[PDB]
Design a binder for this molecule. Structure first.
Ligand SMILES: [Cl-]
Ligand SMILES: [Cl-]
Ligand SMILES: [Cl-]
Lengths: 99, 5, 99
């Protein structure tokens, strides 16, 4: 699809069989989701945002479907104001910015 | 660092 | 232009005569620039993201050129780690996400 930016670009994603709303975020290197349980082991990761750095859990090779497009990659889990889809998965679904 | 903006 | 998300979408903008580097950020409601002086009056505001909140000065009706396209709107100034062009100005240059 083509998504304009008059409103937040929030889309539906599916992870672990659950539907969730998430923000397509070109300013994010990575994908950060609100607290949830994911399979496997996790490793520590520090991320920096507008308000400073926080510690999150890193889960690799996680299946997630975004607006109908499948992606498998790294998902970070931690205290985030909203579920964020970052460039690591935006590139997997072929997303680009255009003007 | 991993930047989330 | 069509901008890839393999790398951070950093572009050159011009504001107050000054040329600067800024991040096209569909995850940001507003545009936030690193500390600088702007003309006109401003009012304080708090904005949040990963890491929490930061206090910024809000200036209205500021003109910026983004990759040659003029855009007018509110510009917040504060301790952001990088200049961020948010949706309030991305809409003005006809910026969309496509996949
Ligand atoms: Cl990944
Ligand atoms: Cl505005
Ligand atoms: Cl439009």
């Amino acid at each position: 699809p083509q998504i304009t930016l008059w409103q937040r670009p929030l889309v539906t994603i599916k992870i672990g069989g659950q539907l969730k709303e998430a923000l397509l975020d070109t300013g994010a290197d990575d994908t950060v989701l609100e607290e949830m349980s994911l399979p496997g082991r996790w490793k520590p990761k520090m991320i920096g945002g507008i308000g400073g750095f926080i510690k999150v859990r890193q889960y690799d090779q996680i299946l997630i479907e975004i607006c109908g497009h499948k992606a498998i990659g790294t998902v970070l889990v931690g205290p985030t104001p909203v579920n964020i889809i970052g460039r690591n998965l935006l590139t997997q679904i072929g997303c680009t910015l255009n003007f | 660092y991993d930047q989330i903006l």
